[PDB]
Design a protein around this ligand. Structure first.
Ligand SMILES: CCCCCCCC(=O)N[C@@H](CCCCN)C(=O)O
Ligand SMILES: CCCCCCCC(=O)N[C@@H](CCCCN)C(=O)O
Lengths: 250, 250
């Protein structure tokens, strides 16, 4: 293995390090995804495509991979600068574009795995998954539950997130999180912290974006890197409606 | 709360955000601690002292908070640059020196909590904890278990790591990790992945440094930030001999 991956030994053999080096990852969303990209790059995944159309905002600094100097810059330009300072020989391809129903299929082509970190206020979070399923591309959905990291993998031949959507209202991250907490309580392991923050968020007078913490960003980035390593080396993983939830109490 | 910590709301109230802002943290060791430092800084902990005498090497980039440009610079110089580019008004005090029996007490004095990330090949890992107990400074011990993050907190009036050290034989991180695996198995939760890497590492022909992965580093950084927040806000915590273990498998 290379001197950069020296301490990866025993956990990974030389042939696995080689395999994940060129494994093409598609990253939709450079918010929580900017933390995921660094952890995955340092692990050894050197072929990452990042698509995001937002700019770096002040409020990102509590949980995303940007600096004071990055504010007002395209997230994709900023995270590529960061990633290429970690690994100059890395293959980091960025696109400062929003995903739409018209362009999303062309971006997906050519990748072996995808990470759906798209805001539900755009238009294509679920269509993205539908297209990936058609192409044998498993999809990681990472969520920042503040204290917890949540990941579920949409597998090509399995259920989609549609199963938790009601046909009359739009579907966002609050539906996934309400699904997860309800699942946990039903099966005898309630996450009262998660139920508490769901309750607090719903009863807010003003309508704001969900809160997120650096802890959940860092934990979910670790989970994704492990899941990516498992998919690339064809080790077993749980697919939706199953999920991975990781927190200080677990 | 500044607009930088805007998305921290509900999880933290404004009075909690202010408290951790000036909460003096001592971080001994800027390796795994460099990942911990960023996650805690973005969370709102703005008063961090970092002590480490090593320089940045190539093998650090697979799991530590450094870049190719940082290589050959004092780890403490690199991590202060990284952190201060995230938050210019942060109070980041560094010391480019190894801790010894003579200097370790004066570094500890003045902090409310400490993170002992000191290599067990130095002379002061256990003495570091003893002084903190004498001063009512709880000590977090974070460990990188590859796929897992492990944190144990030494509380001032509780058991120290001495309890698992053997009178007469040398004590290193493998003793801590072997206690955790044995403890988990004792309780019917064997971590066979963890037991596997211990076996592989012990039966290594050559004597090398333990492997570590970016996955555990990112996970343990999140755990430490949650634990730090709980200690500052006087929320209950688990003390050694109990510990926190977090992995995808759990
Ligand atoms: C009230 C507590 C619930 C918190 C909601 C989760 C918010 C979140 O994790 N949002 C990601 C987008 C990923 C979505 C993938 N379908 C981001 O803002 O990057
Ligand atoms: C064979 C598997 C066992 C792995 C050993 C754990 C190594 C580790 O986590 N070492 C930290 C130092 C923190 C120590 C705190 N008392 C570092 O190298 O930063």
């Amino acid at each position: 293995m290379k001197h950069r991956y020296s301490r990866n030994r025993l956990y990974l053999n030389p042939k696995e390090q080689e395999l994940i080096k060129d494994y093409p990852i598609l990253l939709g969303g450079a918010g929580i995804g900017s933390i995921i990209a660094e952890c995955a790059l340092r692990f050894g995944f050197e072929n990452i495509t990042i698509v995001d159309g937002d700019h770096v905002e002040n409020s990102n600094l509590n949980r995303q991979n940007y600096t004071e100097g990055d504010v007002s810059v395209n997230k994709v330009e900023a995270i590529k600068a960061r990633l290429k300072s970690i690994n100059s020989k890395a293959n980091i391809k960025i696109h400062n574009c929003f995903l739409t129903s018209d362009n999303v299929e062309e971006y997906i082509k050519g990748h072996k795995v995808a990470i759906n970190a798209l805001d539900f206020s755009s238009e294509v979070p679920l269509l993205f998954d539908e297209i990936c399923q058609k192409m044998d591309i498993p999809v990681l959905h990472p969520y920042n539950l503040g204290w917890g990291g949540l990941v579920t993998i949409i597998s090509p031949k399995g259920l989609s997130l549609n199963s938790i959507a009601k046909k009359g209202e739009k579907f966002n991250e609050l539906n996934v999180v309400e699904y997860v907490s309800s699942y946990m309580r039903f099966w005898g392991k309630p996450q009262e912290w998660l139920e508490d923050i769901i309750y607090k968020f719903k009863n807010e007078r003003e309508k704001l974006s969900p809160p997120q913490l650096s802890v959940g960003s860092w934990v979910v980035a670790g989970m994704c890197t492990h899941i990516l390593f498992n998919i690339a080396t064809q080790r077993e993983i749980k697919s939706f409606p199953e999920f991975y939830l990781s927190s200080l109490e677990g």
